[PDB]
Amino acid sequence: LKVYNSIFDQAYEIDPIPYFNFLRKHDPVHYEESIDAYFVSKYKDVKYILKNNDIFNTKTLAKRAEPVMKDRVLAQMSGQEHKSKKKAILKGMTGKYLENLMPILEKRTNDIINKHIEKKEIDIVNDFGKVFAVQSSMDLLGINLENYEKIREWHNGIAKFITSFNLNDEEIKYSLECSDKLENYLMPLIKDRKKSTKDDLISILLEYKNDENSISDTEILALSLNVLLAATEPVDKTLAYLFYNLLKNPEQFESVKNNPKLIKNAIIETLRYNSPVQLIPRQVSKPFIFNNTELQAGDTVICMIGSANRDPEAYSNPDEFNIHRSSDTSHSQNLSFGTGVHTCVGASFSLIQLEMVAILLLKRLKNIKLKTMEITEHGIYTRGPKSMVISFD
């Protein structure tokens, strides 16, 4: 039976919401032959997939990412190893490490603001988010900001490899060249940190011990690259989406201005409404069936986080932005950080960092007005506005 609606239609990337509605209603487990994978659109099926790491495993991430990551990433691990190494990464963004980091992130934020405050406008995507996001990631890791701009360039190249389907011969080579340059820059710093242990995540990874057993330097590089990629991408997107959605709903923007504590809920609702990480793949380990769609071992399923997060079975009026949602007619925990074993280790830090930035932008940019009246969004795997310019006094 031929199907005519395709994730890879040009219309989908422009506006995927009609596709989410169609797929959830008429094809919740939808086959795409161009990448030999099934797309899963409903909240309850995505949740089930992500909660069942034994049936739907993370082995698909060994060729979609490992070629550029140089070694095993966290998502490829399991058992005590995954648990202990995930805890090590969390350590770098909790406790005293978090206390130390946040003032630095405040400095990053105000320095960017100060560069733009006299121009009376700023592009939350291109002026703020893309700069802050990589700087924050480098501060978290302990990489000094001198070669910051080249770090951005390479990051973009590796990201493209991981977030893209059916890359051509020349795109693959550039992504790998970016991976090598990043490897060539970062390895000496790991070697230096090996002797000069600092209070950063790189040092944590060097100090880690699996029973008097350290992890190879190339293992630390991949995990460091895993953190750089993981933390940078979603930050610019979410910040842009947050202020866009608030300014498009002036009542809610004012509520946030009058009650700063509502900022957390606005970020959460932004993550639900405009999920910046859109797709999460898994590999099927054994015959399985959702609705009446049969899956075989070896098949690939791709969870559609944005679709799930707008499922009317999980949220009332799911396609409306409302920072005042709560479970106290229908509300659920959003899947924007995933769920189960591989739930985003950086979830709490992300909410803290985004609230810090939002509060400073709201403090320092007075009488914010929207200038980008209508956004253009790009990306199907990770996804955000091209530009989001605001004006201010």
| Interaction between residue 101 and ligand HEM (CB under 6 A) | no
| Interaction between residue 382 and ligand LBJ (CB under 6 A) | yes
In this structure, the dihedral spanned by the alpha carbons of residues 126, 129, 134 and 140, taken in order and rounded to 10 degrees, is 170
Query: Contact letters (x/-) for ligand HEM, 208-237, by CB under 6 A?
Result: ------------------xx--xx--x---
CB atoms within 10 A of CB 312: 14
Query: Contact letters (x/-) for ligand LBJ, 189-228, by CB under 6 A?
Result: ----------------------------------------
Closest distance to ligand HEM from the beta carbon of 271 (Å): 6
The CA distance from 306 to 279, in Å, is 8
Q: Which residue has the tokens 């944590």?
A: 204
Closest distance to ligand LBJ from the beta carbon of 162 (Å): 4
- Annotated binding-site residue? 30: no
The CA distance from 161 to 66, in Å, is 10
| Interaction between residue 344 and ligand LBJ (CB under 6 A) | yes
Question: Is the CB of residue 178 less than 8 Å from the CB of residue 156?
Answer: yes
Q: Choose which of 245, 274, 309, 336 interacts with ligand HEM (CB under 6 A).
A: 336
Within the chain, residue ranges assigned H as helices are: 10-14, 17-26, 43-51, 66-69, 79-91, 95-116, 130-141, 148-163, 169-195, 201-207, 217-247, 250-258, 263-273, 305-308, 347-364
**Residues in contact with ligand LBJ by the rule CB under 6 A:** 159, 162-163, 229-230, 233-234, 277, 344, 382
**Residues in contact with ligand HEM by the rule CB under 6 A:** 50, 74-75, 86, 89, 93, 140, 226-227, 230-231, 234, 238, 271, 276-277, 280, 336-338, 342, 344-346, 349-350
Which positions make up the binding site?
Answer: 282, 342, 344
Which positions make up the binding site for heme b?
Answer: 282, 342, 344
